[PDB]
């Protein structure tokens, strides 16, 4: 009929073998977009930056709630825009041409089951989108100079957030 399914804090040590999974993972690509990124264009310190805020247009902060306590909805849809424009510009980035290592789909991949997974949270209330463009169009720099270092310039922004979504990530066991 049903097996003993006692209910007291059970489902827990699962997570954190998730967790040390997205560890390893994030370890590689860091290391994997660092390098790569340099071997590509330079990946100096601030410099760049500038040309790649103005022709990038400014994205989501480093966190994404202040707090973690202010409206659950609005985390959601910054959580929402904020992944939907990162797998919009990874999109970008792979749908260029110069591959350079299929790396990037396995990576890809990873913030593909996440963007799943807040997809499914819009389903349980995911209907508020915070950008109207013209109509569908987003996911693609055009392809050039400044787009690929556009690019470069979000992947190290990218790897910021990583470690940032991480961190708060662990600190969610207050209760």
């Known amino acids: 009929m ?47 930056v500038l040309l790649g805020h103005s022709l990038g247009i400014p994205w989501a902060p480093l966190s994404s709630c202040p707090s973690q306590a202010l409206q659950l909805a609005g985390c959601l849809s910054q959580l929402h825009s904020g992944l939907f424009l990162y797998q919009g510009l990874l999109q970008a980035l792979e749908g260029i041409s110069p591959e350079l290592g299929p790396t990037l789909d396995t990576l890809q991949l990873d913030v593909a089951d996440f963007a799943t997974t807040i997809w499914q949270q819009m389903e349980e209330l995911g209907m508020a989108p915070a950008l109207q463009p013209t109509q569908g169009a987003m996911p693609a720099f055009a392809s050039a100079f400044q787009r690929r270092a556009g690019g470069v310039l979000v992947a190290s922004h990218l790897q910021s957030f990583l470690e940032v979504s991480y961190r708060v990530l662990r600190h969610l066991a207050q209760p």
């Open 2 to 48: 049903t097996p003993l399914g006692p209910a007291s804090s059970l489902p827990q040590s699962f997570l954190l073998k998730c967790l040390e999974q997205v560890r390893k993972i994030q370890g590689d690509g860091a290391a994997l977009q660092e390098k790569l990124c340099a071997t590509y264009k330079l990946c100096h310190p601030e410099e760049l």
